[PDB]
């Protein structure tokens, strides 16, 4: 059945208006990059013909999916773009209308024989902005990332995920380049360095986990000490 989205009181400017759409159209999207294979030419033809039967995508994980093209099975990783991309449409060639923003790219990496090979896969030109520059303390960071890792809607990890838990939680998902040529290596070249949102989230969680352990104890104390030892 069609589930009509519920409006929360006090959250809208269009309240009490008659023009209100009951079930508006919500759209999201990402860039899809496939390898320059002989299946690329297959995809081009598919989009031209309008025959989408030779293409399917199985989502295996938050950042991991399997792209099957012409019976060839591709391992893909969803990476974060350093740039924000506004998707517009135009019937005018002149007036451009905003739809949704794209900040991610589903990146095909290599053909795989079995679906669970995607977790062992490494996304090219990607880094981990939580760890980078802090590689000295990367051991402390990793164990927290393993702890924090959760499945769909905060669900416990699957038997599959927990097996590849080390790979999944610790690989880099932050992509180096924009999709446009000038923005090649934009993150390292053409960006003045800031705190990363995914970094801030991690820092916030660690602070929280530390305080939740402080309430679970009786007497606690903290002191700033020199590196020894």
């Amino acid at each position: 059945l069609r589930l009509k989205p519920i409006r929360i009181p006090g959250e809208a400017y269009d309240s009490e208006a008659s023009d209100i759409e009951d079930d508006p159209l919500i759209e999201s999207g990402v860039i899809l990059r496939i390898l320059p294979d002989i299946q690329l030419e297959f995809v081009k033809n598919s989009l031209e013909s309008g025959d989408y039967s030779g293409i399917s995508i199985k989502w295996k994980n938050e950042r991991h999916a399997v792209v099957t093209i012409n019976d060839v099975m591709y391992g893909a990783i969803l990476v974060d773009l350093p740039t924000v991309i506004e998707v517009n449409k135009s019937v005018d060639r002149k007036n451009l209308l905003k739809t949704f923003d794209v900040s991610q790219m589903l990146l095909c990496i290599r053909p795989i024989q079995e679906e669970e090979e995607v977790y062992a896969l490494e996304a090219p030109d990607t880094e981990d902005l939580v760890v980078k520059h802090f590689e000295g303390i990367e051991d402390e960071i990793w164990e927290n990332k393993e702890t924090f890792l959760k499945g769909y809607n905060g669900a416990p990890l699957s038997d599959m995920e927990a097996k590849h838990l080390k790979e999944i939680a610790l690989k880099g998902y932050d992509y180096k380049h924009g999709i446009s040529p000038p923005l090649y290596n934009v993150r390292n070249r053409r960006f003045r360095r800031k705190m990363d949102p995914n970094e801030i989230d991690y820092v916030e969680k660690v602070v929280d986990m530390l305080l939740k352990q402080d309430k679970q104890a009786e007497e606690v104390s903290y002191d700033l000490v020199d590196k020894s030892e």
Binding site: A12, S90, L97, K98, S103, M195, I200, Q213, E219, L224
Partner: protein, 470 residues
């Protein structure tokens, strides 16, 4: 014409696209959503066919007529799609759903006798006179006989640069709504542009700005008029308005209403409110005009600065870096740019405030002035450095082949090469915990925290938490 008209859903401030307060996640990750968190693992994506868009349908039609409903703004049709990739990590303002941008190709006549009106495959050609001022004010130029393609809206103006999409790239879109459950489309990208540095047309509001605080009151005027126009009564109860402000109690709800309505003590209208006719009732269609979508989008850009400010305060151990961000707050920066545009101030153009980290962008930080013949000397060096930076900027974004045109594509920024990973004290965090457990002996653990970002957060809470006083 350069007059901006948005779609209908945009003007209506349609929910959920436009809200009064967005969750902090969408502030922390600004216009950056996690697509993978909203797909249930194991989902098989099969692509659906694009709805054909009849040329007759949008022929000689206005924007709001061409896009009346959110269904007209789907990517599930054949209408060409334009991808504007922002070069800035944190542009001044972005557009929300339904809002319209104009793609303007500015051409400047070489001479008064110039009859030319050049057409590029996309965008609208707009002719600039010889004595006409620059669309980019004093910080950018359109040379005579030259075309400079531009992203135009009521918030920002920025140069754009058309590039080729890698033949490997496609747009995967997920669509749901209008009684229909989520389906997927796979499209070619018609056009790809790199958006240059965003130049603010209008300031971004401050936290205590009267323009922001007055929105709460306007959202009230809004609802009041709507309720009145529905019943025609000119006398209504304050009960159905209160449900639209769940945070406010009986006293607050009443107080806010008296900026508009007065209470009826005796009569058939007793126990009800009439609006003071010092305020004139607007029809529902003109009541939408009280708040523009630009206004909301501008406040979100403001809220993003605010969120990032307090995200830094807690988690940034870097004193020098934290202070930089405080000087880069959008309400300040954008303000100073409008001043410099009116010759009321100047900007540094270079250094730490440059969002690029190299010399490929403008720094909007404020600098001092500007004597007599010495100011003309400084002005000349200023006006030169501007033009110099502008052309470096536009050349940098006009690069088709990275490896041939760039100096070192794999080079690393100044700020990305050398980062401070330690405290000023070079200290760490030692925590000693005593937890009575095991149904027995008191256990003691000693923990060391080497992450200065965590350390800073831990203390700041504890610091404020250590106060239960007053």
């Amino acid at each position: 014409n350069l007059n901006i008209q948005h779609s209908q859903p945009a003007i209506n401030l349609q929910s959920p696209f436009y809200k009064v307060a967005v969750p902090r996640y969408q502030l922390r990750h600004f216009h950056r959503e996690n697509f993978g968190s909203h797909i249930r693992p194991g989902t098989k994506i099969v692509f659906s066919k694009l709805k054909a868009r009849k040329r007759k349908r949008d022929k000689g039609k206005d924007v709001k007529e061409s896009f009346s409903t959110s269904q007209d703004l789907t990517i599930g049709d054949t209408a060409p799609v334009y991808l504007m990739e922002y070069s800035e990590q944190t542009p001044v303002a972005l557009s929300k759903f339904g809002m319209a941008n104009k793609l303007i190709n500015y051409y400047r006549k070489a001479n008064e006798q110039d009859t030319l009106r050049p057409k590029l495959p996309v965008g609208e050609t707009h002719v600039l006179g010889v004595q006409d001022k620059s669309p980019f004010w004093n910080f950018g130029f359109v040379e005579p006989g030259h075309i400079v393609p531009t992203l135009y809206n009521n918030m920002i103006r920025a140069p754009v640069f058309k590039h080729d999409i890698s033949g490997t790239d496609f747009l995967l879109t997920k669509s749901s709504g209008f009684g229909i459950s989520n389906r997927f489309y796979l499209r070619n990208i018609n056009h790809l542009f790199t958006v240059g540095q965003t130049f603010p047309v209008e300031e971004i509001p401050g936290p205590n700005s009267r323009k922001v605080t007055s929105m709460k009151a306007t959202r009230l005027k809004m609802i009041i008029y709507r309720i009145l126009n529905h019943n025609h009564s000119k006398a209504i109860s304050i009960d159905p308005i209160a449900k639209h402000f769940p945070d406010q109690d009986y006293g607050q709800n009443r107080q806010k209403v008296k900026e508009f309505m007065k209470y009826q003590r005796d009569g058939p209208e007793k126990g009800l409110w009439r609006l003071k006719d010092d305020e004139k009732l607007l029809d529902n269609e003109a009541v939408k005009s009280l708040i523009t979508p630009e206004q909301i989008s501008q406040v979100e850009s403001m809220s993003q600065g605010l969120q990032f400010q307090e995200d830094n305060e807690a988690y940034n151990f870097d004193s020098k870096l934290k202070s930089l961000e405080e000087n880069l707050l959008p309400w300040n920066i954008t303000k100073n740019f409008i001043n410099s545009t009116q010759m009321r101030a100047m900007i540094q153009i270079h250094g730490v405030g440059d969002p690029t980290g190299c010399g490929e962008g403008f720094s909007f930080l404020k600098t001092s002035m500007k004597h007599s013949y010495n100011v003309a000397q400084q002005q000349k060096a200023y006006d030169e450095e501007i033009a110099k930076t502008w052309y470096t900027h536009t050349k940098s974004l006009s690069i088709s082949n990275p490896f041939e045109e760039m100096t070192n594509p794999d080079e690393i920024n100044q700020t990305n090469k050398h980062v401070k990973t330690d405290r000023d004290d070079k200290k760490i965090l030692k925590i000693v915990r005593k937890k009575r457990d095991e149904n027995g002996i008191i256990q003691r653990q000693t923990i060391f925290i080497r992450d200065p970002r965590v350390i800073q957060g831990y203390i700041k809470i504890k610091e404020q938490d250590k106060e239960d006083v007053n």
